[model samples]
Target: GSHMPRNSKNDGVDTAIYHHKLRDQVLKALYDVLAKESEHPPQSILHTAKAIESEMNKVNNCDTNEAAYKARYRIIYSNVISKNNPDLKHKIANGDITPEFLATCDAKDLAPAP
Candidate 1:
């Protein structure tokens, strides 16, 4: 079959979705553990985060550690992916954006109200 000119190119999967999926459960647990960081013994939280990163990479295989941190930051800050900024959010999902950028963007603002 002959291929016709298509307006949209076929893009691969959104890497951020996997990260976001891990957010509510895995990352959430990490976040809470970190909150009481000082209370815990030395290297505790560090090892925790490391283990998480290792487990994530075993299956997801995308820069799992970096993705996890990015998702954590996104969830911690106010500007999470939502109806407000559809295009930009997709960019984040597609790896066009970075956690460093989001951290800067959302730094001045506090997390959204529950």
Candidate 2:
């Protein structure tokens, strides 16, 4: 016989699993698109991160299942990885992005929708 994890434990586990699965799907989609497209465009890391943030917003609003979350994550992750922009990494490394920074960043229009 097997025992079930408590809701608290399961919540964390489920979130991690969902995020991992979503990342994979996003990476695959990005790569597929890149393969088919001959040229890649220049993108800032901030722009890419914003896109992911947007998708996460959608996911949150949708009351999505694990599968849907995973799929959306995959799509967003793919775009981030494909773009390979490093603004977020740089900000994290340099401790440059504060709450104020994030707020301002969020307020600005980074890019137009595709």
Candidate 3:
């Protein structure tokens, strides 16, 4: 299960860590949206996801590698959001890549892809 800190303020960690995680979530969501796009061409999603992951790594103090980040992103997309939802598939097929949709959809509602 996805685990967030119990408290946003008193999590006993650097504030940048929280910001990094939040940015990761946002990028992951964007990746999910992109991967499901009707125009999803081969390697497009991976390319974009890798770029964002690299940028995130540059900014954040985390020691994550590009390959690891890409793998994790793939796992989240496949396992968390697109396992068995026909509606989601239809949305993707229709090319609905709105920020509102990405922000609102609970990560838990997504199918857990490996």
Candidate 4:
């Protein structure tokens, strides 16, 4: 999260978090698409989900649902991280990193599309 205003170590499998919101959106949409491809015989498409990238392409199909996905991502994170702990939420609200934030920050909201 080198580019974020306040950063936490992202611990799940999403990826890095500079443009944190955008990163999550891409992770969910891209990977879900890959998983859908996984359900098909032309499974070679899943290779892109490993997301080997040296530089950003600046455009892709996953960008199609960014706003919706980002909303869902944060909603899920906030709710899940809020579970079984209040202090964690307290820390996050105060602009400090919570344990939950660290634990899930890197995780993607890869919930299958509805």
Per-model TM-score on C-alpha atoms: 0.24, 0.26, 0.26, 0.25
Please give the lDDT score at residue 89 for candidate 2: 24
Candidate lDDT scores, in order, read 0.43, 0.43, 0.46, 0.40
lDDT of 1 at 32: 45
lDDT of 3 by residue, 35-110 (tens): 4554536456545554555433443223545454544444545543333222232356655554446554766577
Overall local distance difference test of candidate 3: 0.46
Best by lDDT: 3
Pick out the ten consecutive residues of candidate 2 with the lowest summed lDDT: 9-18
Error of 2 at 62 (Å): 11
Clashes of each: 0, 2, 10, 0
lDDT string for model 4 (56-114, tens) is 22332146545533444344433422232232223456545445565655554653455
